[PDB]
Amino acid sequence: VSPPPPIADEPLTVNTGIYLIECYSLDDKAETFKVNAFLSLSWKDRRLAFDPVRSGVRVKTYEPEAIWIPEIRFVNVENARDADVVDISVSPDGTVQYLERFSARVLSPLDFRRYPFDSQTLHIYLIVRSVDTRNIVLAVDLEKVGKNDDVFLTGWDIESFTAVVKPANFALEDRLESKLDYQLRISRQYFSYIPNIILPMLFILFISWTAFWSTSYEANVTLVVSTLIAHIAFNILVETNLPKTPYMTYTGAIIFMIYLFYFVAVIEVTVQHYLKVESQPARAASITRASRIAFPVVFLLANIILAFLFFG
Amino acid sequence: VSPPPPIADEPLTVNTGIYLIECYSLDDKAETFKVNAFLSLSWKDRRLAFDPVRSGVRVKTYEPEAIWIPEIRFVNVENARDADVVDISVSPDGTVQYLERFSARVLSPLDFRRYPFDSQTLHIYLIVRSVDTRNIVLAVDLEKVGKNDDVFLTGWDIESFTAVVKPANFALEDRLESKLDYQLRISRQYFSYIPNIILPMLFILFISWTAFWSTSYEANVTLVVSTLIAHIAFNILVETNLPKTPYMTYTGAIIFMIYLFYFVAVIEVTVQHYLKVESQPARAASITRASRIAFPVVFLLANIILAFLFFG
Amino acid sequence: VSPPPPIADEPLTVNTGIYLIECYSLDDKAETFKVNAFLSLSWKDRRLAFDPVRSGVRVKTYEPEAIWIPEIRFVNVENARDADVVDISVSPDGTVQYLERFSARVLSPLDFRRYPFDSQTLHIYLIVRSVDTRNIVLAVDLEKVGKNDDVFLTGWDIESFTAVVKPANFALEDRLESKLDYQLRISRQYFSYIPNIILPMLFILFISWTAFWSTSYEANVTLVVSTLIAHIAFNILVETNLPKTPYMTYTGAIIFMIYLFYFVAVIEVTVQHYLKVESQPARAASITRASRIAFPVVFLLANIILAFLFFG
Amino acid sequence: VSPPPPIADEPLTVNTGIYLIECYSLDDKAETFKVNAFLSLSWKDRRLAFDPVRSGVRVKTYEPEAIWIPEIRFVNVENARDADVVDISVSPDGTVQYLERFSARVLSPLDFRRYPFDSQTLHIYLIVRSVDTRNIVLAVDLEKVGKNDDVFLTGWDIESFTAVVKPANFALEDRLESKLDYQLRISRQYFSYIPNIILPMLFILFISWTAFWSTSYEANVTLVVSTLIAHIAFNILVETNLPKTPYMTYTGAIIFMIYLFYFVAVIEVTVQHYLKVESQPARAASITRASRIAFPVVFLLANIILAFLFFG
Amino acid sequence: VSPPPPIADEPLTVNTGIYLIECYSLDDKAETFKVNAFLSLSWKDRRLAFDPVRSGVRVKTYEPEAIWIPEIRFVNVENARDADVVDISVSPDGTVQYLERFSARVLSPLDFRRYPFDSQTLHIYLIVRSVDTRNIVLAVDLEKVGKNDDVFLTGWDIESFTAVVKPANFALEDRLESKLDYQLRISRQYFSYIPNIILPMLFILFISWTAFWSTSYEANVTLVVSTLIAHIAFNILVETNLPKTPYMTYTGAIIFMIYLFYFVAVIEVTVQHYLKVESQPARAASITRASRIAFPVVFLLANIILAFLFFG
């Protein structure tokens, strides 16, 4: 088949719409995610009507090798999509309707700062090949684009799914400047993360801090060092689900602060024991009474400062 | 070949039946599972008989490129199934029998709350393409649908395998409203999970609780903190088989409760030691006698409350 | 080409033989294993001789698209095998010889109870398609079936490789009842498992038991709890190679027994310390003298009972 | 189609240009990396003009099966690239422009010494097949080669992207000596590595060193050995992201030095305790006062020597 | 096309040569390795010259579908190789030159005893299909076979790359007895393994042995048991890179010996404490003085015996 011939130099407008079905496999190390969805195409096909007789008002059904199907390519994909044509129904007026299912892998960038309370935005880009009959300009219709409201992407909630028109902005472009940008906004559910991670760390830190009400040097050493070992083990456990991040993060800053606090506690215990051995009990008592109030207040202030710095 | 022509506007009814062979690879992180099974198709083929002579009562054998094979697509799959035609035998009356083997990947949602005692339900959806001769409506026959009763899906037991008819409920539909829903019910075998997980945790918790019959502060500290380290290590071991779950779970609630109990035990030991140092032995003795009864009763009540909350 | 026409209603007998080459990748979580082997086919081809002249006694060489190659399908495979025809030589008498190499994935069930001393049996099923000329019945010849005696499946030893005839036993069958069952028996080499796993656990348990010859409560607590931590760490190390098993196992029973023994030892130490504090040294001495003989004998008896229960 | 015939024995010069789009999946164990990019081809096509009429100054659009597309193969790839032709536009003058998108896997060597502060250089090699019309020599144009400046390769920064001409230097070559070498320079961002790895190790080492201000043998033993256990656990945590390296590395040297320092500290503590037991307190006091200054200075000098050795 | 006809019953000799390019992905669990290399073919093609005119001394260039390309199959591969023809140049004399690039997966057996100082030998087998014109016998030429001397297989060094002729030795053979065996010898670089594994284990063992110069039972117990825990953790760390080996190994024997030494040290400490409690200090002093010399000498002798046993 051949593309429709021009009529009055009117640009060929193709209305594109993506209907989401399933979103899954949000890989973080590879920064990829697999998507399975539909695709709706509807282009003007005047001067090439298919039996427009009023007595033949029945919807015309055709095959892929019957008329010119426009060629649309995805930019940020690893390979060509698996096209699965479902139905091709065209009204006798001339408007063609096309539906298919595809499952491709999309390359989109992900930022994991503000990890426990982050929001992501996925992008899908579409490019239509040029033709020798008349330039084709992509248009977005708000009726076909949408989602089934049953996306099984666990751990995230979908806020919106829109599409706009943007220039190609490619150094190798010649005439194509009508790419499409589909934006999907998701938000992470952070309810379980608090009891899963934050509270046990605070409990271990408080258990370590309980050494300021004691005097036995051996008991204090055992408490502090064993709590440090427990903290290291819990960090090893936490690192299993956390993705590899080659930049600073809120959780990493918190962990570093906890390490610093453990070091300061060790120093304080050593100083207290040294003073007690050197037989200056008044200074040791004053230091150990001051630390009980000094540590929690400084910890809270540092946490507030870090939260303000990382969340505006 | 071409689809059979209409006769008296009677809708073409296709009887579909899936015969399970092997179910395996129940991936939880991807929320997928691979299935290998048969597929039986039988559609009315009147006015296109194949030598209906009584002397030719022998069963007719044909090839895939001999007659019109109906096109059936799966909705919740990553890609097209691997069709492997086994036999195509049609009686001289006109009824056609079709059998094939396929191995596709199915996308079905899985809930892991009530994890150790959960029950899952897998869904498979079928859609038949429309044709220009007469609308095709899917029908389910109870004879062909079934299982070999030798499914090697370890860790689960199959209760039933039924199929019903449901509307398409798609925003892009035009006339298709005859999707099929195959429901597979499975139940997890929880016998080994008790000795594998629950009992060692209780043993470690009781070992930690054995510190209420002692008076040595160093011994109590060693017991409690080392049992905390052992609990963390056992949690790390348990997390290997548990799937990633971005929501609350019964096991997670139990683990959080155990952490809270460890923290409370540390606080109680510290208070007892502080009282003994401050030379008020009566209060310390009363507290340490009360705790022996207080801890197990509160633990049992909390476990009962959690079980009632998570299991209706 | 076309299948040979019938002569005197004699069923077409096809002699099948599988020659193993390489067996590898015995996946346990997926319960699969990849096999690379040969395949020998020899069927009667009378009335379709290929130059049976005595002066042309030279062996005839043909291509896959020269004569009718029988179609054989594997039942317990994920997808169609990769057929690689090596040679097709047919004698002038009429007997055809066919050889090819394939590498498919086989789905076979594996039982891991009696794990360290278990024996497995792999099954491969073959089905021949029916034809419209004369029913084909599969036959097994003992000359072509065999192995190269150089199977590189490490950790296992091959005992036998036989094949028998069994009914199809399928609910969807029509006339096919001549499936083939190839049985491969393997045995696990358990020599290294003893020094790799069993002996260190016994050493740690004995180190824990060395606390019955001491009196220091702090030393006994340290010994027992630190040995418990070491046991947990060693269990974590062991779990790396052990496959996921959703049912009871000999090793799991042994580990549970070890946990129970640790708990009993903790209870005994606590009771001894409580008696010593309450100033009844005779009873404590009697208990600590009795335990030294009680623990090893009970451990040995329990191990004997478990071995008898799990090994008939 | 056929390649253009020669005119005046002038070698056919093909201008090649690669436009990067996405670089990702820098696998270290396999020493591979996947690249998705464009490819620009422009070759002289005189004597085969495509309607050079001035009134037909419109850009000519063709298909892959319209003219001779030069064949270019990649040397260091696992398999053939996935060619995805985007547009083929040729001016009426005779110059042809070709654009396509490919996603292949490149085999390039990676050196991980100087790991935290290393710089890598990736290579891509191109070879053009010989033809029977006239020898083809590859040329590099500086306009088409480039990058989109939006490479999402996290953890690295791109410095330059150039290309040069080099001899084939193959033992099997006959006449081809015009391979192309595309060099991509990247640098690792080392900011987060310092707080993620280096500082906690120093904190643990200092905590271990705090035992020189004490006299309790049990407390010193507990401190040193528990810090050794914590160091081993932290090394286990660090090894998760570090790639497998079968040669010496800066981090490995640092870890070995830390182990040696722990051993020396254990020896010093044992010697001090032995002297105190043997009742020579002056020597023990002198040794424990000297060690406080000896250890940090030696550690700093050793670190400086290692840094100078590994960084010129 | 058709194979060349026979001339004087002279066997067709094909000179084969493999030129290595990249060797990588030496998987140990699967016992496989991927290889990317060239392949040179040169067979006698007399009586089918391609314009042998002296004025046409120019090298003839052809396509794969121009002449008979001999069929060569690999025996120990999972699937057919990815053939990528580079150039087909034939001199007017009659000798044909063929070059291509392939990337297949090879199944070769690997022995990991003597692991840290082992040497491997990889094998590649080639089989040529028989033809009905004249028997083909494979020959090896020493000029085309070779390597680029730039193999990026890290951790190994290539010593030689030769090829010989061997009989097929297959039970299903008919006339083919001319298989080719390509042997690749590699040696592991063991420099980094010593500081990465061996020395920390010796340091931990010596730290454990430092308990023979002390008398505090609690300190000795803490030292020995905590060093045992550290040894278990280090073994867990080591097991990450070590491949799964279902047979005895030098490293496994060393680890078992270390466990036995830890057990003996625990027994000695317990005996010394029991004697001191029973008030026989002379015997305890004699035992603890003897052990200091007994342990290192026995350890060295056992290591020497193990090395002699495992290395001839």
Side-chain angles (χ1 to χ4, degrees), chain C residues 279-305:
Chain C
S279 300
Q280 300 179 6
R283 299 176 60 181
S286 62
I287 292 180
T288 192
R289 288 196 306 265
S291 301
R292 305 172 184 176
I293 309 179
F295 276 80
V297 175
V298 170
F299 185 76
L300 182 60
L301 292 182
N303 286 267
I304 291 180
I305 291 180

Side-chain angles (χ1 to χ4, degrees), chain B residues 239-286:
Chain B
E239 286 291 338
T240 60
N241 53 33
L242 251 61
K244 299 182 179 180
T245 297
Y247 47 96
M248 274 281 92
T249 323
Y250 190 65
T251 60
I254 294 182
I255 295 179
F256 174 72
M257 179 180 57
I258 293 181
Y259 276 112
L260 185 59
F261 268 80
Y262 271 105
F263 182 60
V264 174
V266 174
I267 291 185
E268 189 273 343
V269 172
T270 302
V271 170
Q272 176 192 8
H273 175 256
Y274 190 86
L275 291 180
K276 286 197 70 274
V277 171
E278 209 177 14
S279 300
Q280 300 179 6
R283 299 176 60 181
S286 62

Side-chain angles (χ1 to χ4, degrees), chain B residues 17-68:
Chain B
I18 296 183
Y19 189 86
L20 285 181
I21 296 299
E22 297 290 342
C23 300
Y24 55 93
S25 299
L26 262 60
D27 297 1
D28 303 333
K29 300 170 272 69
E31 210 174 22
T32 67
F33 69 97
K34 303 182 61 61
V35 53
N36 182 23
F38 268 81
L39 179 59
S40 178
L41 303 182
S42 57
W43 59 98
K44 172 62 63 180
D45 195 71
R46 203 171 186 176
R47 205 180 177 179
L48 285 182
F50 315 101
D51 299 0
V53 59
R54 300 183 179 181
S55 64
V57 78
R58 307 175 183 179
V59 182
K60 318 299 179 181
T61 301
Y62 285 93
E63 279 66 26
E65 50 273 357
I67 55 180
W68 169 79

